[PDB]
């Protein structure tokens, strides 16, 4: 991915946004009760904590573009995934706007609790202003769609969230690059049925883990990924993606039978305009962040990548024997034979992809189910019923998390959510968590869910 140019909103005519740059994150009542070293990300260019130029930092992610069109390896790979997808009988026909906006079972309604696109946010127009669940009415969307048209600029801002201290000195905050509501709708109408089938079928045919419930999906993983596990991390996957990968995506959408109008939406994602504060800028390559299907399209692309990467690195690779699932840049795969990720990484770099050992591991050692990590979580077999797999969120992340809050009124919901994540680590550590929570007068006033009851409920899911 690569910025092509920058121009003042003055010169482009694009509407700016007058944000304040103040974090909504406050130290919580457990702030100094639990241990941690993260704090609110740097939100503006003058944060006293910056040891660098902010804008500099924010955009370093755009490491450039290496391929603009697929070699043979990427073509052979796009086909196999497309082929594999065929057995899904995916509904290639357009979605009603009503469904696209208000949801279905297996396609959730547009979130009224996040920003509508450009120019809506700049003009102070809200999602709730246009959408109403009670009426499921689309005439006002059509009106706004007809008004502002399509292929609008991704309005762009810094994510208000906790960062490590090193990511805060180095100004490594993250961006939210929201598509305009117009394109979100138009996109969902074009691919909403594909989204449904992906949401309904997390697993090894889709190669997707999007919209999965780890509570239960985790147990299915060992079964879906037999043989020799492998896995790595990407350094700025999204921004590192070259246009070749969007070409390769159209290839797949076409083989599975999508129309040429649907397929033309992929370019408006490969090739984008952003408005950050008041400069507008063109990006070419890489995938945006608050874009619809962003997760699904990323995952699909990752499903191609791992392929191309394989048949190119090695010889005698049989792709029918590759098992993967992907969630954006997060991957887990298996294969009958061990796969050298030290090599994949070398060959992957030729493509502009920075790949590194899984779980920040010192090198590309064997990944086994004991160390393996996916959606941040590990895999812990239940002690009594070993075939049931616990999703394990590290306590360290939970500790980091409990020390802050965007709303002090919300301490009860905040804590039980963290408990719903924590107990999976085992009784001994769950109690150690609860006990340090209950080590403070506020914590004792709290209703905290009990271990064996949490577990019971979980059993009932199977």
């Amino acid at each position: 991915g690569e910025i092509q140019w920058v121009k003042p909103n003055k010169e482009t005519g694009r509407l700016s946004i007058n944000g304040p740059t103040r974090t909504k994150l406050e130290p919580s009542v457990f702030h100094d009760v639990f241990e941690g070293n993260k704090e609110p990300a740097v939100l503006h260019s003058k944060d006293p904590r910056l040891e660098v130029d902010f804008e500099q930092a924010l955009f370093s992610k755009y490491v450039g573009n290496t391929l603009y069109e697929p070699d043979e390896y990427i073509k052979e790979a796009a086909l196999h995934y497309a082929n594999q997808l065929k057995q899904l009988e995916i509904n290639t026909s357009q979605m009603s706007m009503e469904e696209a906006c208000y949801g279905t079972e297996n396609l959730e309604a547009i979130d009224l609790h996040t920003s509508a696109g450009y120019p809506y946010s700049a003009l102070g127009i809200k999602k709730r202003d246009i959408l109403d669940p009670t009426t499921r009415d689309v005439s006002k969307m059509k009106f706004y769609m007809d008004k502002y048209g399509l292929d609008l600029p991704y309005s762009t801002y810094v994510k208000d969230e906790l960062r490590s201290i090193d990511k805060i000195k180095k100004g490594k905050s993250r961006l939210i690059e929201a598509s305009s509501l117009n394109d979100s709708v138009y996109l969902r109408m074009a691919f909403g049925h594909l989204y449904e089938t992906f949401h309904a079928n997390p697993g090894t045919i889709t190669g997707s883990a999007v919209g999965c419930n780890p509570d239960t999906f985790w147990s299915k993983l060992p079964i879906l990924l037999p043989g020799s596990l492998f896995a790595f991390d990407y350094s700025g996957y999204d921004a590192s993606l070259s246009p070749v990968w969007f070409r390769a995506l159209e290839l797949v959408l076409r083989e599975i039978g999508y129309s040429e109008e649907a397929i033309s939406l992929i370019e408006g994602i490969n090739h984008t305009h952003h408005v950050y504060r008041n400069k507008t800028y063109c990006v070419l390559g890489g995938m945006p962040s608050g874009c619809s299907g962003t997760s699904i399209f990323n995952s699909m692309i990752n499903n191609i990548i791992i392929r191309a990467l394989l048949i190119k690195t090695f010889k005698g690779i049989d792709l029918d024997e590759l098992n993967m699932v992907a969630y954006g840049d997060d991957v887990l795969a298996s294969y009958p034979f061990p796969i050298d990720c030290l090599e994949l990484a070398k060959t992957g770099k030729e493509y502009g992809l920075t790949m590194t050992p899984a779980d920040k591991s010192p090198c590309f050692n064997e990944v086994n189910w004991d160390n393996a990590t996916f959606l941040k979580r590990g895999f812990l077999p239940d002690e009594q019923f070993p075939f049931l797999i616990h999703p394990t969120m590290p306590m360290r992340e939970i500790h980091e998390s409990i020390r802050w809050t965007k709303d002090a009124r919300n301490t009860q919901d905040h804590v039980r959510s963290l408990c719903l994540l924590a107990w999976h680590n085992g009784k001994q550590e769950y109690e150690k968590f609860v006990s340090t929570i209950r080590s403070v007068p506020v914590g004792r006033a709290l209703a905290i869910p009990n271990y064996e009851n949490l577990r019971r409920n979980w059993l009932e899911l199977f």
């Binding site: 594999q84 090894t204 045919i205 879906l224 394989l310 190119k312 690195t313 090695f314 010889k315 005698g316 690779i317 049989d318 792709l319 029918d320 024997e321 590759l322 098992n323 993967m324 294969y335 009958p336 034979f337 061990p338 796969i339 050298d340 090599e343 060959t347």
Partner: peptide
Amino acid sequence: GAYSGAPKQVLKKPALRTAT
């Protein structure tokens, strides 16, 4: 794919594309 195969030759350890 992913599930079980069949025809019609044994699969051997992947072999690293050399030079090429």
